[PDB]
Amino acid sequence: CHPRLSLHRPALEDLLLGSEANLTCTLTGLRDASGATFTWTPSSGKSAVQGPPERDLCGCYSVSSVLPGCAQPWNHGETFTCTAAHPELKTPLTANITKSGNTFRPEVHLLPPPSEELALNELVTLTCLARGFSPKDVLVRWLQGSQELPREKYLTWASRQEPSQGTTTYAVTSILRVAAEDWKKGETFSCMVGHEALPLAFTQKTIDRLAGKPTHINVSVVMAEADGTCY
Amino acid sequence: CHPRLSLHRPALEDLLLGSEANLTCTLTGLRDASGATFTWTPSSGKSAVQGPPERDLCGCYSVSSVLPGCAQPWNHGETFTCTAAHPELKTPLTANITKSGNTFRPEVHLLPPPSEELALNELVTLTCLARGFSPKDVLVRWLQGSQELPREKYLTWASRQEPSQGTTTYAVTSILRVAAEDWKKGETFSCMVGHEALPLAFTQKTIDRLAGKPTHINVSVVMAEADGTCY
Amino acid sequence: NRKESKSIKYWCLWEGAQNGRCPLLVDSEGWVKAQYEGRLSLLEEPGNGTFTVILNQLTSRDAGFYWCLTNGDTLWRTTVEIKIIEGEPNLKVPGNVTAVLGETLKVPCHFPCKFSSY
Amino acid sequence: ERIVLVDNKCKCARITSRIIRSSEDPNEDIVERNIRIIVPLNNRENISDPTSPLRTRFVYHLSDLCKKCDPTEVELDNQIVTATQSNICDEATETCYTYDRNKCYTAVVPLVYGGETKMVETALTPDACYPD
Ligand SMILES: *[C@@H]1O[C@H](CO)[C@@H](O[C@@H]2O[C@H](CO)[C@@H](O[C@@H]3O[C@H](CO)[C@@H](O)[C@H](O)[C@@H]3O)[C@H](O)[C@H]2NC(C)=O)[C@H](O)[C@H]1NC(C)=O
Ligand SMILES: *[C@@H]1O[C@H](CO)[C@@H](O)[C@H](O)[C@H]1NC(C)=O
Ligand SMILES: *[C@@H]1O[C@H](CO)[C@@H](O)[C@H](O)[C@H]1NC(C)=O
């Protein structure tokens, strides 16, 4: 029906680990059939796949395609033009996608368990937290010693923005529940965070016991024949 | 396309802090916005006024209604039986709703701020984690001293389900950033959580700087041959 | 005090003008002040440690400090502060209802849905 | 030694704490926590007479000392709601280590009076079981 505004960038979960970056840009508005027109102004040896449509709001269709151009033009600042055309009105609002600027780093904290859960001998719980990062894309993984845990042992919420003073920032949490015998053995755990405003793309924090231990302890044993209790 | 009938539950906020438990009844997937009639099987305050035929897939018809009636029968486990009889179908169809059983009550924990965030003297973070509850509805408020903070000073995520230790339970989190002057001075902060399985429907946790990790610990053990009465 | 249950109860209003003074407003024996007519009464329930007093038709000048005192030998005097904040009354009644000469009247009074069990 | 966090009488433990702040170097202060335990050397494990030997093992968990469950009042918007303050006090079942000076403790013993036997009641702390 009426044309709208839509955006789709490359995926971070494949941009930080592998080099299988795929661009896929969107512009919709469905009244007519296939009248396909592109803008891929760098097209340096890429062939755009197209496929079948899928389900939409009871009759309408929408189209897109993929360019595999991971030769670092995206984190340089190419603008990668997106603009439709049809036998229709030649007045688009356009999409021009690039690596964005004014980026900030996250600040990561890893919290110890509550002392109520320790004195019950069941599973205990840990909490990761990151806040202050400027685009809302982030990855969170857990480790045990050096082994990465499978990603169906832990829960991670989404990425939401904060109340602030002018500059806008974002935050995210996650939890992991382990057994109390593993905590009281002395095994360590870690939270890893990936983001694109970090220079080495990863940060770590690690926790165990003996981390927030106090540094001074006075023990006095008062024997018999010396009781002096006051009310 | 396809017309269906769906039924939503009452919201948690007006059930606890108030009692006005207005219900609703939604069918979607028609295109003729004049013919609709609904019918409930218990109807003493029967004047259930229908809602506007608002927007749909590119401006189609989608109508719902509201039955007023407050929260005494919903807690005892009644039933409600909305059905629709619109002219774009040849069948009246029905669903129902009931306050669910098989519920568990949550465990609330407040976590003291991290140590590294206190060394900079700008702002500090408090975290509220509530866990192990069987429905998908929860509330989180914050208080300073005995004064409730306004809702735009803290960020709360959504309710999601955690990995399976047999039966399904859920979780939620919340954070609040306060000034590092009145933390060190000694003000108190509270996290309150409301859910349907708790007996008085609310529970509270309060923390301040004294009830956290100390730096010094003095232990004095006095052995008493005299009596066992503890004056 | 429970051991002084055969006493006589009073309700002050702390003036604070000269040095300090209790004008008495209502007693347990059936007297009330003139200017508080139609908006004050003292009630003996629940008893056994405690009586209650009802003051309605509030105005913003009714804020102040109020005292209650018994007649027995040991006298606790208890003070409560009435503040006035803005909002809406829960129960809802009409204005000042007249009467016809020679036929009936009827007066309504609503309530919200948290009072449905009271 | 200034602000009392807990003063418990079933286990007879007391915990106070205090902030003592230096003005120079405002990044580091000290927070003190004082604990006092009084160990009874002549009480039984269950409190009746013939139970078991002297209790010789005494266990204190900080999360059960500081536990607070009597309800409170919170004002949310313009409302008074009653909240609980703890997760763990499901009703007692707690084992007490000492007596409490304001509660009294009795036992029941059978003795004979020539014919059949009665169900004589016996005070265990005589200062507190006076009927008045
Ligand atoms: C610690 O010791 C006390 C004293 O023996 C225990 O209290 C009592 O335990 C008895 C034994 O089961 C209970 O007996 C019941 O007595 C009633 C008469 O009141 C009788 O009709 C019943 O048929 C039954 O035999 C009794 O309920 C109980 N409580 C009292 C007398 O108040 C106590 O249970 C012991 N605690 C532990 C943890 O071992
Ligand atoms: C990309 O499209 C937007 C749409 O308004 C426009 O504002 C922007 O200037 C375009 N980029 C360039 C380089 O023209
Ligand atoms: C209520 O729902 C159940 C299962 O969804 C089913 O028996 C039927 O749809 C309804 N029955 C009654 C009596 O309302």
Tab-separated table of C-alpha atoms in Angstrom, chain A:
chain	number	residue	atom	x	y	z
A	1	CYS	CA	0.000	0.000	0.000
A	2	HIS	CA	1.784	3.083	1.291
A	3	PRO	CA	5.611	3.063	1.126
A	4	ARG	CA	7.432	3.205	4.442
A	5	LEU	CA	10.910	3.388	5.972
A	6	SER	CA	12.914	0.241	6.727
A	7	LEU	CA	16.564	-0.529	7.480
A	8	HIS	CA	18.723	-3.664	7.572
A	9	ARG	CA	22.469	-3.720	8.310
A	10	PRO	CA	25.031	-6.571	8.382
A	11	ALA	CA	24.934	-8.940	11.328
A	12	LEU	CA	27.384	-8.449	14.179
A	13	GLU	CA	27.359	-12.113	15.211
A	14	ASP	CA	29.082	-12.939	11.907
A	15	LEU	CA	31.087	-9.694	11.579
A	16	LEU	CA	33.238	-10.182	14.691
A	17	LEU	CA	33.924	-13.901	14.350
A	18	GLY	CA	33.935	-14.842	10.660
A	19	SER	CA	34.024	-12.972	7.381
A	20	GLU	CA	30.617	-13.973	6.023
A	21	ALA	CA	29.201	-10.442	5.985
A	22	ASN	CA	26.052	-10.101	3.865
A	23	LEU	CA	24.433	-6.787	3.005
A	24	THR	CA	20.646	-6.793	2.565
A	25	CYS	CA	18.845	-3.451	2.259
A	26	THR	CA	15.092	-2.863	2.369
A	27	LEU	CA	12.486	-0.687	0.688
A	28	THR	CA	8.861	-1.811	0.673
A	29	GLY	CA	5.429	-0.606	-0.342
A	30	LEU	CA	3.273	-3.184	-2.080
A	31	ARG	CA	0.664	-2.462	-4.723
A	32	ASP	CA	2.038	-3.966	-7.945
A	33	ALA	CA	3.822	-7.157	-8.995
A	34	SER	CA	7.542	-7.660	-9.754
A	35	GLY	CA	8.800	-4.392	-11.242
A	36	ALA	CA	12.258	-4.913	-9.793
A	37	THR	CA	14.906	-2.184	-9.826
A	38	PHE	CA	18.139	-2.089	-7.847
A	39	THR	CA	20.777	0.184	-6.514
A	40	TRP	CA	24.055	-1.595	-5.926
A	41	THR	CA	26.556	1.062	-6.869
A	42	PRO	CA	29.487	-1.068	-5.781
A	43	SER	CA	28.843	-4.337	-7.624
A	44	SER	CA	32.404	-5.567	-7.932
A	45	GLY	CA	31.805	-9.279	-8.583
A	46	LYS	CA	28.737	-9.994	-6.502
A	47	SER	CA	25.641	-11.814	-7.704
A	48	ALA	CA	22.447	-11.015	-5.828
A	49	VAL	CA	20.359	-14.046	-4.933
A	50	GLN	CA	16.581	-13.741	-5.033
A	51	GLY	CA	14.007	-16.259	-3.861
A	52	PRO	CA	10.311	-16.890	-3.280
A	53	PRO	CA	8.183	-14.429	-1.295
A	54	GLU	CA	6.674	-15.236	2.081
A	55	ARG	CA	3.631	-14.332	4.180
A	56	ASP	CA	2.577	-10.716	4.719
A	57	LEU	CA	-0.586	-8.781	5.624
A	58	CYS	CA	-3.029	-10.945	3.588
A	59	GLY	CA	-1.984	-10.486	-0.039
A	60	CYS	CA	0.981	-8.110	-0.209
A	61	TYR	CA	4.558	-9.040	-1.144
A	62	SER	CA	8.035	-7.576	-0.521
A	63	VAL	CA	11.473	-8.145	-2.073
A	64	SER	CA	15.193	-8.027	-1.170
A	65	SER	CA	18.561	-9.553	-2.145
A	66	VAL	CA	22.094	-10.160	-0.808
A	67	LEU	CA	25.626	-8.941	-1.648
A	68	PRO	CA	28.562	-10.836	-0.081
A	69	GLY	CA	30.983	-7.923	-0.349
A	70	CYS	CA	33.162	-8.417	2.727
A	71	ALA	CA	36.348	-6.779	1.423
A	72	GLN	CA	36.167	-4.070	4.130
A	73	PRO	CA	34.135	-1.362	2.392
A	74	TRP	CA	31.565	-1.148	5.196
A	75	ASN	CA	33.753	-0.224	8.150
A	76	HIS	CA	35.505	2.337	5.938
A	77	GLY	CA	32.528	4.591	5.213
A	78	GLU	CA	31.004	3.737	1.836
A	79	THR	CA	27.402	4.868	1.728
A	80	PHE	CA	25.902	1.838	-0.083
A	81	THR	CA	22.936	3.471	-1.806
A	82	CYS	CA	19.376	2.133	-1.423
A	83	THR	CA	16.724	3.619	-3.716
A	84	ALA	CA	13.732	1.975	-5.381
A	85	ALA	CA	12.165	2.609	-8.781
A	86	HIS	CA	8.936	1.456	-10.437
A	87	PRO	CA	6.307	2.622	-12.876
A	88	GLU	CA	4.960	4.761	-10.020
A	89	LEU	CA	5.611	8.175	-8.449
A	90	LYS	CA	9.338	9.019	-8.540
A	91	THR	CA	9.513	10.491	-5.042
A	92	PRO	CA	11.318	8.179	-2.573
A	93	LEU	CA	12.656	8.800	0.847
A	94	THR	CA	15.931	6.998	0.507
A	95	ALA	CA	18.232	4.793	2.550
A	96	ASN	CA	21.971	5.362	2.699
A	97	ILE	CA	23.722	3.046	5.140
A	98	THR	CA	27.210	3.262	6.597
A	99	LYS	CA	29.236	2.624	9.709
A	100	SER	CA	27.893	5.210	12.112
A	101	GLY	CA	29.857	7.702	14.177
A	102	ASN	CA	29.811	9.173	17.688
A	103	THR	CA	30.300	5.776	19.308
A	104	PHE	CA	31.015	4.994	22.960
A	105	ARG	CA	32.357	1.929	24.743
A	106	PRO	CA	30.491	-0.343	27.154
A	107	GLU	CA	31.460	-0.676	30.804
A	108	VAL	CA	31.065	-4.229	32.078
A	109	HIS	CA	30.443	-5.422	35.641
A	110	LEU	CA	30.116	-8.989	36.934
A	111	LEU	CA	28.343	-9.431	40.289
A	112	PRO	CA	28.751	-12.043	43.056
A	113	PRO	CA	25.856	-14.237	44.270
A	114	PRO	CA	23.501	-13.221	47.067
A	115	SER	CA	24.343	-14.735	50.431
A	116	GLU	CA	20.822	-16.109	50.908
A	117	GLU	CA	21.268	-18.622	48.084
A	118	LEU	CA	24.673	-19.779	49.419
A	119	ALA	CA	23.277	-21.059	52.718
A	120	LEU	CA	20.827	-23.444	51.061
A	121	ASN	CA	23.002	-25.765	48.866
A	122	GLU	CA	21.150	-25.590	45.560
A	123	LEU	CA	22.012	-23.754	42.369
A	124	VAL	CA	23.556	-20.286	42.815
A	125	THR	CA	23.247	-17.357	40.417
A	126	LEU	CA	25.543	-14.814	38.746
A	127	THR	CA	24.793	-11.566	36.904
A	128	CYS	CA	26.519	-9.776	34.028
A	129	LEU	CA	25.779	-6.144	33.177
A	130	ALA	CA	26.990	-3.718	30.512
A	131	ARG	CA	25.837	-0.139	30.076
A	132	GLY	CA	26.772	2.986	28.173
A	133	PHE	CA	27.324	1.875	24.574
A	134	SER	CA	26.138	3.937	21.630
A	135	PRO	CA	24.699	1.539	19.009
A	136	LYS	CA	22.451	-1.155	20.354
A	137	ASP	CA	24.318	-4.193	18.993
A	138	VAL	CA	26.180	-6.447	21.420
A	139	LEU	CA	27.053	-10.108	21.988
A	140	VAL	CA	27.191	-11.868	25.363
A	141	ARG	CA	28.818	-15.268	25.980
A	142	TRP	CA	29.742	-17.172	29.132
A	143	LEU	CA	32.788	-19.271	30.006
A	144	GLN	CA	33.762	-21.749	32.712
A	145	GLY	CA	37.502	-21.655	33.131
A	146	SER	CA	38.401	-21.806	29.462
A	147	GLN	CA	35.373	-23.694	28.120
A	148	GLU	CA	32.621	-21.764	26.392
A	149	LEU	CA	29.278	-22.968	27.668
A	150	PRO	CA	26.562	-23.895	25.158
A	151	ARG	CA	24.178	-21.044	24.631
A	152	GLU	CA	21.065	-22.790	25.956
A	153	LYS	CA	22.194	-22.779	29.589
A	154	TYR	CA	21.699	-19.050	30.171
A	155	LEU	CA	19.160	-16.289	29.641
A	156	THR	CA	19.923	-12.932	28.036
A	157	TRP	CA	17.514	-10.020	27.796
A	158	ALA	CA	17.447	-7.528	24.911
A	159	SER	CA	19.234	-4.176	24.566
A	160	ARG	CA	17.323	-1.101	25.742
A	161	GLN	CA	18.114	2.559	26.235
A	162	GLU	CA	18.532	4.498	29.475
A	163	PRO	CA	17.292	7.768	30.954
A	164	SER	CA	20.116	10.187	30.430
A	165	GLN	CA	21.394	13.746	30.072
A	166	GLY	CA	21.586	14.547	26.376
A	167	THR	CA	23.756	11.751	24.989
A	168	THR	CA	21.894	8.489	24.401
A	169	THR	CA	23.263	5.154	25.618
A	170	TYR	CA	22.108	1.556	26.023
A	171	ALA	CA	22.313	-1.387	28.449
A	172	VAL	CA	21.951	-5.189	28.642
A	173	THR	CA	22.045	-7.954	31.299
A	174	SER	CA	22.295	-11.770	31.474
A	175	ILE	CA	22.371	-14.479	34.178
A	176	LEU	CA	23.864	-17.961	34.609
A	177	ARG	CA	22.949	-20.479	37.319
A	178	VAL	CA	25.599	-22.964	38.475
A	179	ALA	CA	25.726	-25.559	41.248
A	180	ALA	CA	26.943	-24.650	44.738
A	181	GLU	CA	29.499	-27.468	44.811
A	182	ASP	CA	31.184	-25.982	41.734
A	183	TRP	CA	31.259	-22.554	43.355
A	184	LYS	CA	32.646	-23.920	46.615
A	185	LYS	CA	35.282	-25.984	44.803
A	186	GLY	CA	37.018	-22.904	43.433
A	187	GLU	CA	36.063	-22.937	39.769
A	188	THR	CA	35.947	-19.558	38.039
A	189	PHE	CA	33.453	-18.099	35.582
A	190	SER	CA	33.561	-15.294	33.050
A	191	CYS	CA	31.351	-13.010	30.979
A	192	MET	CA	32.492	-11.935	27.496
A	193	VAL	CA	31.067	-8.914	25.665
A	194	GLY	CA	31.499	-8.020	21.991
A	195	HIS	CA	30.926	-4.571	20.518
A	196	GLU	CA	32.220	-2.557	17.583
A	197	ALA	CA	33.392	0.538	19.467
A	198	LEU	CA	35.924	-1.506	21.390
A	199	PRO	CA	39.375	-1.576	19.765
A	200	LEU	CA	39.977	-5.312	20.225
A	201	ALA	CA	36.235	-6.166	19.968
A	202	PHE	CA	36.081	-8.045	23.296
A	203	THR	CA	36.333	-7.525	27.045
A	204	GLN	CA	36.306	-10.016	29.905
A	205	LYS	CA	35.543	-10.071	33.600
A	206	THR	CA	36.093	-13.026	35.918
A	207	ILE	CA	34.709	-13.978	39.332
A	208	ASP	CA	35.036	-16.680	42.004
A	209	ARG	CA	35.241	-16.698	45.770
A	210	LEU	CA	38.052	-14.775	47.501
A	211	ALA	CA	37.249	-11.689	45.419
A	212	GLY	CA	35.471	-9.389	47.853
A	213	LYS	CA	37.159	-10.806	50.928
A	214	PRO	CA	37.673	-8.453	53.889
A	215	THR	CA	41.163	-7.526	54.958
A	216	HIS	CA	40.886	-7.308	58.757
A	217	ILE	CA	39.506	-9.826	61.255
A	218	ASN	CA	39.545	-9.620	65.062
A	219	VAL	CA	38.604	-12.716	67.068
A	220	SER	CA	38.483	-12.547	70.864
A	221	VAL	CA	37.425	-15.540	72.965
A	222	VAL	CA	36.202	-14.612	76.447
A	223	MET	CA	36.510	-17.524	78.855
A	224	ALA	CA	34.617	-18.449	81.985
A	225	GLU	CA	35.153	-16.499	85.245
A	226	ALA	CA	35.143	-13.274	83.193
A	227	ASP	CA	31.553	-12.635	82.023
A	228	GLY	CA	30.779	-8.931	81.810
A	229	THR	CA	27.737	-8.721	79.529
A	230	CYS	CA	25.818	-5.477	79.415
A	231	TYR	CA	22.137	-5.170	78.597
